[PDB]
Amino acid sequence: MDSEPPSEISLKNDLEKGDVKSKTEALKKVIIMILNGEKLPGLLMTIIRFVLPLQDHTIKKLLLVFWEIVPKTTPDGRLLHEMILVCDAYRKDLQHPNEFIRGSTLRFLCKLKEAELLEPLMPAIRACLEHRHSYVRRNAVLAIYTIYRNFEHLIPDAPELIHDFLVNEKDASCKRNAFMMLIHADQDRALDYLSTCIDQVQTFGDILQLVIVELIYKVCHANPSERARFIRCIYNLLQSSSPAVKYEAAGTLVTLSSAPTAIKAAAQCYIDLIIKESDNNVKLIVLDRLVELKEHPAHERVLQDLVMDILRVLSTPDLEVRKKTLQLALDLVSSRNVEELVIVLKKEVIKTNNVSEHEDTDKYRQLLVRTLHSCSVRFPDMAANVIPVLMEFLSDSNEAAAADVLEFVREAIQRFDNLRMLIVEKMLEVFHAIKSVKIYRGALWILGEYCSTKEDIQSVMTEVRRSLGEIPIVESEIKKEAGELKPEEEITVGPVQKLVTEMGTYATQSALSSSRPTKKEEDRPPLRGFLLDGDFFVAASLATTLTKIALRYVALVQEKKKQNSFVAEAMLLMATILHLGKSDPVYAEAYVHVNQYDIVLDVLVVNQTSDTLQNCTLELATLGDLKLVEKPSPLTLAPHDFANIKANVKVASTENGIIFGNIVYDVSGAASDRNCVVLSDIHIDIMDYIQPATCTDAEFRQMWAEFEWENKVTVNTNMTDLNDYLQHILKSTNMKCLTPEKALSGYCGFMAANLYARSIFGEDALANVSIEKPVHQGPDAAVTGHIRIRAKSQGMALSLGDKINLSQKKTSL
Amino acid sequence: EIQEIVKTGLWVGDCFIYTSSVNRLNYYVGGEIVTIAHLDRTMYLLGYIPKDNRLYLGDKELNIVSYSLLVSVLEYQTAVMRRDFSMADKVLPTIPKEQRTRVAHFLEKQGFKQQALTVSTDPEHRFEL
Question: What are the CA-CA distances from residue A437 to residues A334, A406, A433, A515, A533 (Å)?
């Protein structure tokens, strides 16, 4: 009988039957239905009658079982007395020669904090005063303590009965087996006795002595219990810069992340931390101790650095461990992050050296070039390293492989003015075999800026200019680029001037030069030719032309703040980006009142009628996410009764199977068809059910992408900013205004709120409230705001859309 | 009696350089145990062959691995043990950063907070001294 709540009639029958097995099974079936929480008092006389005196342990044990989980509730066969049918003949049970029945009886009897059993539990310590097992003596210290807990904090429970009444706790210390139920409030002499016992311990018993009294002067003295306290005590005597090298903490710690890569990744972190405490700049974070595994002697054999190499990773162990490991290389050794990121990047970025680090997918290659290159932009020393490695990247000599390479290096030159003169000659080489945009773009920029340095350019450019591949974006990049630097410093059959001619043709003009350009018609609609066409005031010469622009870098460009940079090593970053970091007539009148922060729905129940409505009961219901914190409890609604009855309200619950409308309120009365009527007290909305939750800009952005929010409305009374009406109203449809999606200035400055919720509707809810408050001569519609809304199938989107207008209720009875 | 157990050991002068069951190469000076270096794996001291300028270690292999003994550290610390704190300071220009702070801490443990203050690179160790 797993859980069957109607079966009590059969149990009575089964409980006495003249067959002992049946009786045991019955009583067992009662236990299992109560434990789940089901019907049990009908049976009581039957249950109690067979078992009572006997020394036959199994039925007695079963009855003994049922007296610690419901004795108080059941009363057919027990009623209320001092020597109840729980203990009257269980004084026999306590005083049987078999330890088990006595012991069991003692154990339940003393366990209860019952006051209708207080006297019978007190000399119940007799059953276990003699200690036939470790179990008997432990059973005794726990039972005396449980007696002490049960209203006997004074002389009824404190001395000895004949050996224990609160003194097993003392005795246990010096006896062969220990266990101290003495944790609080008990004899001082036993506490003292436990200390002595630390030495003459029994190990289970030591965990009991130890919860009470901890800290040792020793190293130990033995056993897991003492050992477990000991690592706590050690952390005290050296708190300083974490544990560093984990103590006896290490054993539990592995299981704490049994799923399976995460342990190594964690372990790797600690091992890296431990090596050294470095400068602790941007991603140079290694704490713990400065010297404890050093770094870098030149006589150390086979050195520290061997372990450091693991941390430099491509994936060399698996991805979770990889992400931890790349950060960890950066963390022990660099200048900041820059130094060790360049080494690390050199390995990752595409080459002709190894083909286990090159790939023909263009974005990844490109990104890897940008990561290597960002290190230079960060720190100078890296410029010198980066440029020759970049030329190796080029040497791959696939159209695309060159292409990616050329694209970053060209950015580097914008930063690094006439420093990378050397690269230009390498960069031209792979520009001729071509099937893509990227190669043309980049090459034309290097060869263009670099012209003073070289003289090749008609020849290199011209094979490509009459070759094909994909050429949209090529136009833009060649347009600003081709002439640049020194007015007449090249010549192969086209000097720098031919280049300016070319540069202009490629931009949007027409001219025979480099055997004509591939295309002329520019990239995306805004860019066009014209700016540059106007430009080249002084023909490709460092002055105030293309050259200027080329040998200068747009805004601030420093660090790895992503200003001509990309922020570490490209593969590690994907993982970091991913991390969102999300945090019968009846009359009612009613108002909601709050006194001393108690929120209640006031209801007055009125019988305007002369007719009888007796049988009157009042209930507030649990609909779904609405709940009663206590229904109105008066038996009112009688002939010409006016009553004030208070129903307390909650807003947060779990969905019930009954209707999901406004608030259900139920009054009952006389009638047999409609004994229960549902009638209303004032408004509560569907919107309550939504649950508020919040987003950060990353979670908002991810969800924006994840599912559409095209749906918009413009809501009146969003004249005001985010903070005022809009927040308060948004709150009531369990929403909250978080992070921005705005871009403010002297022409821009709609207020933008990123909203989130996680509705109990199987959807989230998100929105952006844009408040069109004029920051221009031509506003949208002046003050008002357009709320762009969604939910996960946009079923709550709509709630956001209208619950940001207005919202107010009041009455004054 | 020395803290780190001696799995195997060797005498270089009256100083005992030994391996430990922690994989630590330590040296005994003064009845104090200092760690000269950390061994990454389990290693045994074959002997010290002046020719190679090395201590020859062997793993499980009947082959050679070599650790040169860090004499400058050892001499700084040995001098400290003898209570020749000044003498150990002469060694200090050839004790690097964190090692000067450590050797300083050795000097200090033996005694004389001030001489330890001059050698300690780290300002914090100076500040406390």
Answer: 36, 11, 12, 19, 22
Nearest residue in chain B measured CA to CA from A295: B98
Q: What is the 3-state secondary structure (H, E, C) of A52-85?
A: CCCCCHHHHHHHHHHCCCCCCCCCCCCCCCCCCC
Please give, rounded to a whole number of angstroms, the shortest distance from the CA of A287 to a CA of chain B: 15
> Which B-chain residues 38-97 have CB contacts (< 8 A) with chain A?
38-41, 57, 65-70
Q: Are A688 and A631 in contact (CB under 8 A)?
A: no
Nearest CB among A291, A297, A302 relative to B70 is that of A297
Cα separation values, A368 from A364, A435, A564, A681, Å: 6, 21, 14, 66
Q: Are A300 and B67 in contact (CB under 8 A)?
A: yes
Distance between CA atoms of A402 and A404, rounded to whole angstroms?
Answer: 6
Side-chain-side CA neighbours of A485 within 13 Å: the count stands at 25
Residue A186, token pair as written in the block: 């008990």
Taking residue A208's Cβ as centre, other Cβ atoms within 10 Å add up to 23
CB contact under 8 A, A294 and B66: no
Contacts of B35 in chain A (CB under 8 A): none
Output DSSP code: residue A456.
-
Selected residue of B26, B68, B105, B122 to mutate for chain A interface (largest A Cβ count, 10 A):
B68
Q: How far apart are CA A122 and CA A775, in angstroms?
A: 83
Rounded to whole angstroms, the Cα distance separating A748 from A771 reads 11
For the record, the structure tokens of A378 come out as 């960060």
Residue pair A613/A637 in contact (Cβ under 8 Å)? The answer is yes
- Asked if residue A636 lies in contact with residue A618, where contact means CB atoms within 8 angstroms, the answer is yes
- Environment class of A123 (CB within 10 Å of its CB; exposed 0-12, middle 13-18, buried 19+): middle
Chain A with chain B: Cβ pairs closer than 8 A: 34
Left (φ > 0), alpha (ψ -120 to 50) or beta: where does A238 sit? left
What experiment produced this structure? cryo-EM
- Whether A290 has its CB under 8 Å from any CB of chain B: the answer is yes
Q: Tally the C-alpha atoms within 13 A of residue A422's C-alpha that lie toward its C-beta.
A: 12
**Per residue, what are the HEC states of A242-310?**
CCCCCCCCHHHHHHCCCCCHHHHHHHHHHHHHHHCCCCCCCCCCCCCCCCCCCCCCCCCCCCCHHHHHH
* H or E stretch at B55: strand B54-58
Query: Taking the C-alpha atoms of A16, A22, A28 and A32 in order, what is their torsion angle to the nearest 10 degrees?
Result: -100
Place of tokens 């050259």: A547
Q: Which amino acid is at A436?
A: S
Name the strand (E) or helix (H) holding A647. Answer: strand A642-650
DSSP per residue over A720-746, as a string? S-IIIIIHHHHHHTT-EE-S-----SS
**Preceding-residue numbers of gaps in chain A (C–N over 2.5 Å):** 583
| Annotated resolution, angstroms | 23.0
Residues near A324 by beta carbon (within 8 Å), at least 6 away in sequence: A265, A266, A268, A269
CA–CA min distance A282, chain B (Å) = 21
Q: Which of B67, B99, B102 sits opposite A301 (nearest CB)?
A: B67
Question: A294 and B38 in contact by Cβ < 8 A?
Answer: yes
Is B37 at the interface with chain A, CB within 8 A?
A: yes
* CA A773 to each of CA A436, A670, A752, A802: distance values in angstroms, whole numbers, following the listed order: 46, 60, 11, 19
Give the span between the Cα atoms of A559 and A733, in whole angstroms: 44
